[PDB]
Write an enzyme that holds these catalytic residues in place. Sequence first.
Site, PDB file in Angstrom:
ATOM      1  N   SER A  72     103.917  27.505  59.727  1.00 48.95           N
ATOM      2  CA  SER A  72     105.000  26.826  60.430  1.00 48.95           C
ATOM      3  C   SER A  72     105.461  27.573  61.684  1.00 48.95           C
ATOM      4  O   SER A  72     105.516  26.998  62.758  1.00 48.95           O
ATOM      5  CB  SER A  72     106.201  26.604  59.510  1.00 48.95           C
ATOM      6  OG  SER A  72     107.262  25.977  60.223  1.00 48.95           O
ATOM      7  N   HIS A 100     105.145  19.868  63.130  1.00 50.80           N
ATOM      8  CA  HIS A 100     105.404  20.075  64.549  1.00 50.80           C
ATOM      9  C   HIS A 100     104.159  19.925  65.429  1.00 50.80           C
ATOM     10  O   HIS A 100     104.275  19.875  66.653  1.00 50.80           O
ATOM     11  CB  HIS A 100     106.140  21.410  64.800  1.00 50.80           C
ATOM     12  CG  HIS A 100     105.264  22.625  64.790  1.00 50.80           C
ATOM     13  ND1 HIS A 100     105.211  23.503  63.720  1.00 50.80           N
ATOM     14  CD2 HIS A 100     104.456  23.145  65.736  1.00 50.80           C
ATOM     15  CE1 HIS A 100     104.393  24.501  64.007  1.00 50.80           C
ATOM     16  NE2 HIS A 100     103.929  24.318  65.231  1.00 50.80           N
ATOM     17  N   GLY A 127      99.467  28.655  68.113  1.00 56.76           N
ATOM     18  CA  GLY A 127      98.195  27.986  67.945  1.00 56.76           C
ATOM     19  C   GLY A 127      97.732  28.060  66.494  1.00 56.76           C
ATOM     20  O   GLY A 127      96.947  27.230  66.053  1.00 56.76           O
TER      21      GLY A 127
END
Length: 198
Positions: free
Chosen positions: A159, A36, A141
């Site tokens: 994740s 992601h 972050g």
Amino acid sequence: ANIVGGIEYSINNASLCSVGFSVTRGATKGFVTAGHCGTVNATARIGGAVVGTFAARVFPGNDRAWVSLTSAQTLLPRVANGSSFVTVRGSTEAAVGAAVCRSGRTTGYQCGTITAKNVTANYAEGAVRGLTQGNACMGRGDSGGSWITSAGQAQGVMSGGNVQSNGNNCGIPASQRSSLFERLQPILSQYGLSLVTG
């Protein structure tokens, strides 16, 4: 730049994530991180300099990626723990109940235990299945950052998790935390990667 697990890197001069682990693919240097964090060909920067680009990623479904680095980068078998380092010694997968720590640019180095495996996360983009859950806290972050045991066994990459309004889940008890990581083993085999160890 020196490649150490847990350190910050930016993607296309925009989002920030954390380095998972230094790896090699034949002669190519790289680091694993969360899918992601970037799309294929996205540019990664550390310390204001371009260090490489996203070679491949799978997100959602899974949540993994590896950044192919220029030969000028310095791969290290280490994960950041404050100003110190945890040496990466292998990738033996720990069992539920084991202590485990994680490293990232937002909350730093946090420890807890592994509470469950094969957990599904329903993210904005779709479901990500097969994640391992721990109760070490994390925040926005920390994504892509290292999950490793104190004995140096690399577990996976950050994740997601149940972050609260303050952006992390450090302000709630461990018993209420769901911090999820993508297992390292399938990332290594999917991309034919070898972990840099010491």
